[PDB]
Amino acid sequence: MKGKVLGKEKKAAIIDARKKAAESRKNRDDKRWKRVLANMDEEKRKKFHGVGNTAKNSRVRGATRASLLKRTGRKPDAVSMEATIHLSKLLKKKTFSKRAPLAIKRIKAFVGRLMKTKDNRIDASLNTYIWHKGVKGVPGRVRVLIQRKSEHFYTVISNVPVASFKGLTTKTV
Amino acid sequence: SHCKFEHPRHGHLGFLPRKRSRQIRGRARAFPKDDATQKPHLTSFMVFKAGMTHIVRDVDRPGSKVNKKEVVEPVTILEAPPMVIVGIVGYRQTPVGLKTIGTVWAHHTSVEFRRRYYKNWKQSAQLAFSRQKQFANTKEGKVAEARTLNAFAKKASVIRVIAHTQLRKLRNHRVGVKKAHVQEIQVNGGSVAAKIALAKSLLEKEVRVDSVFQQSEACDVCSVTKGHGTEGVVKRWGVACLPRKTHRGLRKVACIGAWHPARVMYTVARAGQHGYHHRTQLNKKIYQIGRSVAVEPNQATTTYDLTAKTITPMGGFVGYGTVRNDYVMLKGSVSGPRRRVMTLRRPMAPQTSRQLKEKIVLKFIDTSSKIGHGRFQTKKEKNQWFGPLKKDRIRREERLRK
């Protein structure tokens, strides 16, 4: 329901009733799997491999993955990230004379969705990297440094030259 | 003037109009005739299509040049998790057709069943069936259930159960839907009282496919074909292309009618929708009803091929993934793409011919990769061909320094 209809405090209460009640308890009640498994003939009917949260490199049965992630205060205005963008899957079978301009638009949209900005400014180094093999020869991957700033928010996006793209993940710097 | 030369018309006029189907699921338009002598039983089940493959078998057919010889046959794999029964309905005959008498609901329902009544379930109040749930257990609700069951006993002639799928048990990542599919399944056999007793016994419980179908019988399939959007006359109806030098285009019907009647008739071919139509397909033989991999890992091992392997090919079913529940293997093809839900039905046609009565024994089931030209049946076979590779050498030299 709408947060301008209900007070902010009222909106908090509805979220709490679902979060700690009828979701958290179900978890604590279904804990009873330990009680059943300890009584179950050892080996014997042990064909219960997955149940009970006793298995290598598996998920937490009973709760979602999103409900376990750590929540933190909203990030500050000024923040810097480093990321890889896979442009090859975005530009597949596109008309050859439009590949570099479309790459510019796609990069802007990617960063804009990530950073909640409408004003995304492309640095000269990134523009040169995207165009440096002609209009049809756009590289398959690119690594970008994204800096958000406030005057109204906007981003500056620039190129990070790398030797190989293997093993790199999104980082906050 | 009569046409100089004659040929049969293009297309079947009994499949008109070629419009999009009203729903995406396959629904049986009729059920096999009820024979009151038999024991009460269910007549359909819902399954999900996951790719196809091929098998080898010996043929038992006197008089055929293929007698006692090995043949290769393509098959389709359909995943079949158990269904859950949530309600009972009854119908009475009238001079204008069948009418629903009432519905008996189960005392508890699943969240997946209740999700089917909303468009945004997560951001809602989630109050479906709450009043019915609390009212059905008081003194008056019990009386009302007794009343409606007696009305079924007195006036009904057809009994059906309401059943739904279990997507949480399906555990597939490309089937995005989370609200259950719901359908009526008719109960055939016995008398009305016996039907009611069976339907009341299996209320709030789940039903497996192997309790509806047996291995070597046949079935009918109800499903919706793949869509292709707006299609031209050459593909939609199979008319001939015109010569190269034709002005204004070649992929057309040249004459769409005579001077009289001064009209275009419903029998002439025109451009329009092709695909996404409902179809009922007749005699599909069941080759295997397979147990869940968690229960029995050697799904695709036969008596003649002792290799241990599952029904999932190397690299997975393209666009679908792993098969993790019970499954059925049908001979041949079925309408519709991968991931679509379809209905299996008990057969209508006579099942007395030799081909329908034959007993099937599999000798080889293919599990090579469907990406590319697969040439290995197992990962162990691939690892026997290639020895250790550079990646393995690095792994075994950096996992030993510790």
């Binding site: - | 090995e70 080889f364 293919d366 030209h373 040439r375 290995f376």
Partner: protein, 65 residues
Amino acid sequence: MRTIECEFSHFAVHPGHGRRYVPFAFLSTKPVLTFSRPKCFALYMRKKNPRFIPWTRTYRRIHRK
């Protein structure tokens, strides 16, 4: 059925895969040759020697071990 080896590469050919070919100048002991891939058949037509193609069993056996 039985698994057959490809004429050019000795890849294993399982039931329901591949293509079989019979030449006019047929050998009495091998009238029919089995090919696992169009690439293998094309190389055999071009008359290459399998011992120089690095992904064949012949090459692997004479070089790697």
